Amino acid sequence: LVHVASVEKGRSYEDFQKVYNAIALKLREDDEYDNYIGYGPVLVRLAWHISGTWDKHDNTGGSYGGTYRFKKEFNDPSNAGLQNGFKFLEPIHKEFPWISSGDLFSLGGVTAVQEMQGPKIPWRCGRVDTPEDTTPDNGRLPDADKDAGYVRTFFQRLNMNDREVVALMGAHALGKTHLKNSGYEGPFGAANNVFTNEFYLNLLNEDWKLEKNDANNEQWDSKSGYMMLPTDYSLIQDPKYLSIVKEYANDQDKFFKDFSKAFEKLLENGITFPKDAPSPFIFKTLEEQGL
């Protein structure tokens, strides 16, 4: 397929900054969600899930079409719990009905990161809502009960190399696992809603014990009370991945830079941007705007 980015007719930067501002202000206000963690993490996951169904081989899936809106994609068992991110964005959508769904879901991901003190992620508008029929079948999102090899291979379908996968994985410093959603339970770290290189440090410095949970799945549990999925732990089992985790554990800055690039790339997979398209936008945070 060929998915060409088409700007929302008549809209510019300022129009988008306003959508961002609305998502941001609503993140600030609804902070009771999930025991005071807020919706930041779920939105990050939301943007990654809508973009992870991409397949470099035939161009299907990816964020373009906003297919997550259709039943089949919405009801994907791997997307269990995402419904909450979606409800959070509905009123936003009703307030700016001109934005395409794929642009809104991805933007929310960008806003969450930034408002959570993460790096600035350049973003581009242009996604266009496609028909129900372009909805990818379930099964394209990864399983968490595997190893590094699995990880490597899987990521390959999205065009990501070792550095890219390690980077992207640091998102697992945010939020937690929920038994009813995935069969996993427990916060990944301590900050939970502040974006840092925590993930890497936790991986190198905790005393993890392999245990089974009430869902009967194995998970790595730490004495401080955190958790790591088998796929997460495999990052320290692979020699190539391990040196990357060390780098990140040593330089938040480098991580932020790498994550940023990678994040954008992830959200743009499958999209063709015409030569006249506006450059990517860099939104100001509520803080930078004094709001």
**Which residues of this chain interact with ligand HEM, rule CB under 6 A?**
41-42, 44-45, 48, 81, 142, 144, 151, 168, 171-172, 174-178, 181-182, 184, 229, 231
Breaks (C-N over 2.5 A) in the chain follow: none
Q: Can you tell me whether residue 174 is helix, strand or coil?
A: strand
Cβ closer to ligand HEM: 182 or 250? 182
Going by DSSP bridges, is the β-strand pair 227-228/218-222 parallel, antiparallel, or unpaired? antiparallel
Cβ closer to ligand HEM: 19 or 82? 82
Cα(128)–Cα(138) distance, integer angstroms: 21
Cβ closer to ligand HEM: 128 or 203? 203
Q: How far is the CB of 177 from ligand HEM (least distance, A)?
A: 4
Cβ closer to ligand HEM: 154 or 283? 154
Is the Cβ–Cβ distance between 101 and 129 less than 8 Å? yes
Q: Can you tell me whether residue 222 is helix, strand or coil?
A: strand
Q: How far is the CB of 97 from ligand HEM (least distance, A)?
A: 27
- Neighbour count for residue 165 (Cβ, 10 Å): 20
Q: How far is the CB of 182 from ligand HEM (least distance, A)?
A: 3
Is the Cβ–Cβ distance between 191 and 37 less than 8 Å? no
Cβ closer to ligand HEM: 60 or 177? 177
Question: Look-up: residue for tokens 């190198």?
Answer: 204
Chain position whose Cβ is nearest to ligand HEM: 175
Cβ closer to ligand HEM: 77 or 274? 77
Q: How far is the CB of 221 from ligand HEM (least distance, A)?
A: 15
Is the Cβ–Cβ distance between 191 and 179 less than 8 Å? no
Q: How far is the CB of 263 from ligand HEM (least distance, A)?
A: 6
Strand partners, 192: 174
Q: How far is the CB of 37 from ligand HEM (least distance, A)?
A: 6
Is the Cβ–Cβ distance between 256 and 243 less than 8 Å? no
